[PDB]
């Protein structure tokens, strides 16, 4: 009987402050604005995971297109030639190869052209 | 005419930045008394340009 709620509330607010560490203004000092910020951060990350996936996908595609155009072929033609040659290498490794080992990418585009034409 | 949103400590400090103080650039020394007084003013004893007026 007569349960006081001081320590529980203090811990529950200190956890929110710890989560909201590094924010600007009241978002890192009070509880009323911090809760609206930590909740808004989870909602952002829940979408930004898929957004990171899409951004990395389109960056790998852009790098592959750049390397293909430097070699003398288009990105769509390169992908079509790879699929007709029935290889299974992915965009991330293709972009990494184009960045680091360029002669390997030249061999890949030659293989694609041989199967395409 | 009253505010609608609470200002911030950053804006308060930016406003107060121009409310600082400027110290004395340098002091003057009497030729014979060797004291330190303000420019073009007299000392605490009554000396000015070496002469005595008090």
């Amino acid at each position: 009987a007569r349960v006081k709620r001081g320590v529980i509330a203090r811990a529950r607010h200190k956890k929110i402050l710890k989560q909201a560490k590094g924010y600007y203004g009241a978002r890192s000092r009070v509880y009323r604005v911090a809760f609206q910020a930590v909740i808004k951060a989870g909602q952002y990350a829940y979408r930004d995971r898929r957004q990171r996936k899409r951004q990395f996908r389109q960056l790998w595609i852009a790098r592959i297109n750049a390397a293909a155009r430097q070699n003398g072929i288009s990105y769509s033609k390169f992908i079509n030639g790879l699929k007709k040659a029935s290889v299974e290498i992915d965009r991330k490794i293709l972009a990494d190869i184009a960045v680091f080992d360029k002669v390997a990418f030249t061999a890949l585009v030659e293989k694609a052209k041989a199967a395409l034409a | 005419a009253v505010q609608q949103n609470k200002p911030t400590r950053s804006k308060r400090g930016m406003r107060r930045s121009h409310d600082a103080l400027t110290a004395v650039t340098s002091l003057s020394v009497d030729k014979t008394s060797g004291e330190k007084h303000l420019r073009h003013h007299i000392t605490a004893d009554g000396y000015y340009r070496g002469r005595k007026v008090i």
Binding site: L59, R63, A66, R69, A95 | -
Partner: protein
Amino acid sequence: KTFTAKPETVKRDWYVVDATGKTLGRLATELARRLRGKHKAEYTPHVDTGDYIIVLNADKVAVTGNKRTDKVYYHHTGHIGGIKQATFEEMIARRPERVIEIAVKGMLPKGPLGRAMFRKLKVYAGNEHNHAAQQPQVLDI
């Protein structure tokens, strides 16, 4: 892990192009591509990996259709009635260097990075430059 570009170790080359007999919409796009670095495998969204491009004979740019009389360039000074209107021929006759710059700025992304990319375009109005010390390479469109 995905490779990223570092502004300190990245290299930039100098290219020179003549805008004689080519179109704005098919030259400024290539300029924007080579300024954003989409022609290099080291392309990154947040790093300016592009090359310094110099443009010569900007007054000799060729435009088809009736755009030389119907191509207006609206802008606003900031005042209530501060609206101005020009045309392609007036722009060429008065400030010819500001006909490629508008197109390239519109095509480039808007922001500090876009402004940094735009800072590399040395657009001139003649057939000579003063950047021969950089040893530029001639480029075709």
